[PDB]
């Protein structure tokens, strides 16, 4: 707050340069953006004889893991995390705009395209089902229900659709949004879902009936479009019911739920899903759109919000008057997506930038703090991340899946040398 996270881009095939093992000197570049738009081109020489690397005086470059490299260049630290698997290998070419995963027994993946197609994939990224023309236009979001046996999609076509994983059937179509549906949150098992839209609404739906039972919006301006939503639990007790009194028609597990909404104006609003009260509004401190936000997975008092100017802010909902951290990433370039997983924040910036930022608890404690001085870049071939998906595999380890345009579907290892 306000400190800037220095972005580096490594030559995508640099690993092949390092393990080439040629007799002669070779070289790869690391471009460091400095407003960004301009840059410093660092040349890392890969000495022949496999006798190592020369990063220049005062600089280092080194392998710290099978798929993890560390550079220090002009006093800035960078980590570079390389692909462990291309998931687009056996897939027909689409521009991916949405992803989710589920694993009850078998692990599965769903992907949504700019063309409106949904693909169901298995553990090995082999196509298991294609739902062609699932929507008229771009799938903006895809979620499995917790059963793993159903899914919900959202689209520019202003509808949401519930699909069966069994047969690709479409038992429900949720209509009523007046603009693009941008986001989805599932309440508990999903008898209720929430959808966000550029029409300014967050609609609470009951799925059995396929109707909207409540519409939330920004109290100051109901037409301020919603880019992102996140659901959190205010308190983790106690249903049926440790207090008086209820209840609300056609609501299932809404009690103690709050929904956070990032707006086109850049404000953020928080709604008690049960009471229907707007509890909080965070100011558009940066005078631009809040494109994406996400809740801290350890402490839901803390949220992370990415804005159209490249500001990443951390807010404490208890103290809504000012952010508790501000971090510029390629100022002037939009943050497209922020996503909390495995004690880290994943951040898509502009057309080319994907960063994993570690979150620690502050020593002078104890409140989560972004490790902004030591970003990790998920190395691609100048590919654009539309969305991240955390894959805890079988047994509490993890990988991150990125999907994007031009058939980008790439897996990254998160665990440590």
From Swiss-Prot:
Top-level taxonomic group: Eukaryota
GO biological process, one term: proteasome regulatory particle assembly
CC per GO annotation: cytoplasm; cytosol; nucleus; proteasome complex
Keywords, comma-separated and alphabetical: Chaperone, Cytoplasm, Nucleus, Proteasome, Repeat, WD repeat
Family annotation (InterPro entries): WD40/YVTN_repeat-like_dom_sf (IPR015943), WD40_repeat_dom_sf (IPR036322), WD40_rpt (IPR001680), WD_repeat_multifunction (IPR051179)
Role description: Acts as a regulatory subunit of the 26 proteasome which is involved in the ATP-dependent degradation of ubiquitinated proteins. Is not a genuine component of the 26S proteasome, but an auxiliary factor that interacts with the proteasomal ATPase of 19S regulatory particle (RP). Acts as a chaperone which regulates the highly structured assembly of the 19S regulatory particle. Involved in the substrate specificity of the 26S proteasome and is especially involved in the degradation of ubiquitinated GCN4. May contribute to the stability of the 26S proteasome in some stress conditions.
Protein's UniProt name: 26S proteasome regulatory subunit RPN14
Main localization (coarse): cytoplasm
Quaternary structure annotation from Swiss-Prot or TrEMBL: Associates with the 19S proteasome regulatory particle (RP). Interacts directly with RPT5 and RPT6.
Entry keyword Cytoplasm: yes
Cellular localization per UniProt: Cytoplasm; Nucleus
Protein source organism: Saccharomyces cerevisiae (strain ATCC 204508 / S288c) (Baker's yeast)
Family: Belongs to the WD repeat PAAF1/RPN14 family.
GO MF: protein folding chaperone
């Amino acid at each position: 707050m306000t400190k800037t996270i220095t972005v580096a881009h490594i030559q995508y095939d640099f690993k092949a340069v390092l393990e080439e093992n040629d007799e002669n000197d070779d070289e790869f570049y690391i471009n460091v953006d400095k407003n960004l738009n301009e840059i410093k081109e660092h040349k890392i020489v890969v000495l022949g004889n496999s006798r190592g690397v020369d990063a220049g005086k005062g600089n280092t470059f080194e392998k710290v893991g099978s798929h993890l490299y560390k550079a220090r260049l002009d006093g800035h630290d960078f980590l570079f995390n390389t692909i462990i698997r291309d998931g687009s290998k056996m897939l027909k070419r689409a521009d991916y705009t949405a992803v989710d995963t589920a694993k009850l027994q078998m692990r599965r993946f769903i992907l949504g395209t700019t063309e409106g197609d949904i693909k169901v994939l298995d553990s090995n990224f082999n196509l298991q089902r294609e739902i062609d023309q699932a929507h008229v236009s771009e799938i903006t979001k895809l979620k499995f229900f917790p059963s793993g046996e159903a899914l919900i999609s959202s689209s520019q076509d202003m509808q949401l659709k519930i699909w069966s994983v069994k047969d690709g059937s479409n038992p429900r179509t949720l209509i009523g949004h007046r603009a693009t549906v941008t986001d989805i949150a599932i309440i508990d098992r999903g008898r209720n879902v929430l959808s966000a839209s550029l029409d300014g609404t967050i609609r609470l739906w009951e799925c059995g009936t396929g109707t909207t039972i409540h519409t939330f919006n920004r109290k100051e301006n109901p037409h301020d479009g919603v880019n992102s939503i996140a659901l959190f639990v205010g308190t983790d007790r106690q249903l049926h019911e440790i207090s008086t009194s209820k209840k609300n028609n056609l609501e299932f597990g809404t009690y103690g739920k709050y929904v956070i909404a990032g707006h086109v104006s850049g404000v953020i609003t928080v709604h008690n899903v049960f009471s229907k009260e707007q509890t909080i509004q965070l100011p558009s401190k940066f005078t631009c759109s809040c494109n994406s936000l996400t809740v801290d997975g350890n402490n839901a008092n803390y949220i992370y919000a990415g804005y159209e100017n490249g500001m990443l802010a951390q807010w404490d909902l208890r103290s809504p008057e000012c952010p508790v951290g501000e971090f510029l990433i390629n100022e002037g370039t939009p943050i497209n997506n922020v996503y909390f997983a495995a004690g880290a924040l994943f951040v898509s910036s502009g057309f080319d930038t994907s960063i994993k930022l570690d979150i620690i608890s502050d020593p002078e404690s104890e409140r989560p703090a972004i490790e902004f001085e030591t970003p990790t870049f998920l190395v691609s071939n100048d590919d654009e991340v539309s969305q991240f998906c955390y894959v805890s595999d079988d047994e509490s380890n993890g990988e991150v899946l990125e999907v994007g345009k031009n058939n980008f579907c790439a897996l990254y290892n998160l665990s440590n040398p």
